[PDB]
Design a protein around this nucleic acid. Structure first.
Lengths: 184, 51
RNA sequence: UGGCGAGAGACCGAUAGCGAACAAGUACAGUGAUGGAAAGAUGAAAAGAACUUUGAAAAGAGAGUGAAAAAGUACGUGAAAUUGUUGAAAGGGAAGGGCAUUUGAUCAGACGCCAGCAUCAGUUUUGGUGGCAGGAUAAAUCCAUAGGAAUGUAGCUUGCCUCGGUAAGUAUUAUAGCCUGUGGGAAUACUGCCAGCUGGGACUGAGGACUGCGACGUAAGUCAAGGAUGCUGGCAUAAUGGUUAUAUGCCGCCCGUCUUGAAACACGGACCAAGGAGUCUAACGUCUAUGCGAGUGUUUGGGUGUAAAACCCAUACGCGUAAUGAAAGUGAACGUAGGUUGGGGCCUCGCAAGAGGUGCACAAUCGACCGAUCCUGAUGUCUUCGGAUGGAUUUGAGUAAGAGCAUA
RNA sequence: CUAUUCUCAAACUUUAAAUAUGUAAGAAGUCCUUGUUACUUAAUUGAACGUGGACAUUUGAAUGAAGAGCUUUUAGUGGGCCAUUUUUGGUAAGCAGAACUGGCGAUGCGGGAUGAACCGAACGUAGAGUUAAGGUGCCGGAAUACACGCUCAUCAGACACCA
RNA sequence: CCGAAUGAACUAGCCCUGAAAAUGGAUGGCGCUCAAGCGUGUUACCUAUACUCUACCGUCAGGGUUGAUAUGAUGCCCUGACGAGUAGGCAGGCGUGGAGGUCAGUGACGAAGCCUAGACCGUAAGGUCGGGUCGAACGGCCUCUAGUGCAGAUCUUGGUGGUA
RNA sequence: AUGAAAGUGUGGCCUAUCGAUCCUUUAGUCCCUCGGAAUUUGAGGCUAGAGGUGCCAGAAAAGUUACCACAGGGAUAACUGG
RNA sequence: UUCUUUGCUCCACACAAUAUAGAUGGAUACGAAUAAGGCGUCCUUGUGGCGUCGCUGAACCAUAGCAGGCUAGCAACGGUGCACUUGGCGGAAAGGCCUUGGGUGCUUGCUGGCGAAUUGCAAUGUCAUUUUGCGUGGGGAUAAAUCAUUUGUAUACGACUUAG
């Protein structure tokens, strides 16, 4: 019985949300059903993105939505954000759209409604698009969180030192310039 | 499939898989003869064999 | 962390909590400074046991009080170590333990217990027989035939001589046989196959309406076909079973620890009860949950209150929303916020295979933008200021449609 | 000096293994045209990257694939020891020190009587069947089995590591 | 003279010499001599926690399914593989002192405690019940919290032994 | 620099010949700073060296104990045993 | 061993126990050799002639009947129990071997005549051998030791040797 691999190794993927939220579990229930029956690749993506954690569902901005509909041919699709849809006061023009999020911010809800658009849930979406007909699934940038600039620090990575004060006297002298000993 | 029975006995899973099991049994193909009036011994092979 | 007077508690509950719940800084030790215990509970009420009898007496056995004396001032409950008696069991230089059953005691399941047989399914052991395959289409044996020899068959011959006896040579089958060649038919072994047939045995019976795949028959139906049913008996309780003690076969070094290595002639451990060792905090890394999200955080404080709660709230402030330089400083769009190879998902044509389009995250890469460093050095001008403009195998914890703040 | 001769080399060598070891065996591929460039060229030649076409049944060896890739964080550890083979020091060692692998540590179980390391096999709880190493006189489950030899010891011999 | 095999020189098998240590002594013991020794061959045979089949436990993986279809979607169910372990990690639970909520919970017709070669449940941590003693409180479940579980520390205090 | 040139040359034909922070000192540069605002000394900075740590990733350091002590160690000696 | 009678023993019965190293036809008698014998036969009685036998006890003997009933006989003059007598022989652990006559039972040597069911299709389907005290009714016999005292051939104490 010369085992090739690790015996009784877990898949290593979330099969449920560690969230104990009642309304998320009702939403997972709907999408576990649709994922099983529909046999449309969309429903498997949405089920997993519902299981995903706060660090892995970063907020998709309205400005990022406006950019994803700036694309040619994909201007009338429904914008599936699985996570928060945040506001961006940077842009001024916003088109008439329908966006299916978990949560909106009071600013994001104002801007999408004012353009003339429809703020959808995932169940309001599922009742109109069982197979995600004419959808555009988006994700916010994961590798922008402030913790990720310290991941795999060493010489000469150009990664952020974990520090609490940021001026001179704090981690610039020896080993950050050829003058004092060496550089990185 | 609650039980793997065995093709080689029970006779039923032998007649299920391999329907030719009937024809083989009926014609007795496991007991085919069917010659000879040849018949061709050797010339030198026998001398090289004995020596 | 003092003194006095009050309210409190997700605190401690007599080895705890203060050293002190008690005549506790008391008893007691030391010359002295100082050291410093143990010790709460009968019952509602003493109703704290009148009176009788044994004994010198303490006390005993009665009687009584009591709701209880299995509450007697040795006092609620009264564990274990340890001991007495009774009851039961075992015992040839320990005992204790494991698996299995016997025996004795014992006890729930009152609604089942224990079997025998038949025909089947899964598994597997042990026969008995049948049909084929191949080899040097076995070799052999066997038959025919050719030649030959010896451990020389019958005869032949010479010797001893009982004339029917033996040695020796002769001779190739005769009054026996043998080997080697060639030829001719087979047969059995060895090995192999059979979707051939038939006995003997054991362990298992999981599952639980149907659905499947087959076979069988002219067929309807039947079947050993996707897991055991049918018939019969005895018993209905300590009979099976469990618990327990004991006996018996075999096995079993004493745990904890440091150690390459512990049964160790290495360390701790006589025994028992109770207490007895990863805590809280300030500040942080990761990951996760929650809120809100270009913001976020009410609670230092104010207002309020059913009063340390809850509820409400202004101005700041912290962190984030901009980086880089030692610093004076300067400070993020040529382009669809770039091009390229990937890329889930979505859109189009289609039956589908697929092709084409759009491509988030993320990954590599080439660029662009900001600060620094090295130059370049325009219009100008307080004539030494200003630094446009464009480069550099240089550099940064940067920009490039924000992710963070607060709490757990 | 010449031609012969005997025997040698961790720090000699012409020659030169075995075992280990690098790389390749294709879509980021091949072929045919053509585009910029401040690099290079005598040049209209190149070089790097492309545009546009063309070849997917055999997608360009075998076998496997238990999912493949990616990241964060943090425990313990940092005395090791043993065995066949290669091997240094040493008379040597149950000695000291290396190489590759396998083991013990951290491992029970069957066997070598006993044993950390040897052999066989790695372990949920049971039933049945079959075997490994090892054995089958008796202890002791299992032939006082069969077969050909050898040996007689007033110190027989008897199973690898191993006494 | 006699009357049918010899003469060396070597080679290796099993024995024998070489072969001496202290308690009594070990092919494991007994014993074994055409072996129960040595060499070799052939079958049969015995048995591991290994291998095959089957059951059950668990873990992991891939699936199906409340579709009006009431009884659990974190549920039920299908299929397949797998199971050693110090240091160590993680997960699921068992138990204790308190805390909020709930069962209009139990209780002087007997709470809690203790004793029990009686019973039942649980792989287990443990839980539940019967009998006794006893006499005033205590529990299930959903959550909060911690001075939360002992055999070892020549541990602490108290008590007890064998020696006797 | 050399050479007619191709070219070769960023020390020794190649494999060794060497040294952090802090401090001091030097070279560079019409540089920045000395924070109420000026100038010149003065000091401090920025970029590259040097003064050195041979225990060579870099403490600043002599004995003695037979009067001795504590935490340990069979990781390790003095006796047996193997 | 008592006379309080009722206690001790040996034999017979019934009874209430108590077990089982493990009945389930029979432990069936030369010695000696094994490169030699056994048994039968003969008679110049020997270490003798002539047969025969082995090659396993797979033998031999027992071997029928309600787990063995009740009955009519025929044939034998037998076999075999239960109790009794005769002479004996056995001392290694002889506790058993013979051996008389008798008796009384049975006999499957052979013909008969009834009975058996229902233990329901198996359930050991109970039948052996001990340790026995328990009442019956018969035979028989009618003690010692220890302590206390004493001695010193002995003596730590027990014990030993004495004495009454």
């Amino acid at each position: 019985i010369d085992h090739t691999s690790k015996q009784h190794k877990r898949s290593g993927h979330r099969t449920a949300p560690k969230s104990d939220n009642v309304y998320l579990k009702l939403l997972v229930k709907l999408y576990t059903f649709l994922a099983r029956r529909t046999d449309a690749p969309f429903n498997k993506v949405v089920l997993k993105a519902l299981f995903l954690s706060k660090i892995n569902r970063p907020p998709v901005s309205v400005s990022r939505i406006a950019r994803a509909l700036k694309q040619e041919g994909a201007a009338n699709k429904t914008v599936v954000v699985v996570g928060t849809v945040t506001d961006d006061a940077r842009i001024f023009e916003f088109p008439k759209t329908t966006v299916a999020a978990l949560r909106f911010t009071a600013g994001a809800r104002a801007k999408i409604v004012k353009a003339g658009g429809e703020c959808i849930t995932l169940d309001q979406l599922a009742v109109r698009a069982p197979k995600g007909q004419n959808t555009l699934i988006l994700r916010g940038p994961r590798n922008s969180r402030e913790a990720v600039r310290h991941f795999g620090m060493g010489p000469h990575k150009g990664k952020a030192p974990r520090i609490l004060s940021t001026g001179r006297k704090f981690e610039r002298a020896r080993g950050r310039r050829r003058s004092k000993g060496f550089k990185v | 499939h609650v039980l793997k029975k065995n093709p080689l006995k029970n006779k039923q899973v032998l007649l299920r898989l391999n329907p030719y099991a009937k024809v083989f049994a009926a014609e007795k193909l496991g007991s085919k003869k069917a010659e000879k009036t040849g018949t061709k011994p050797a010339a030198v092979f026998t001398e090289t064999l004995k020596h």
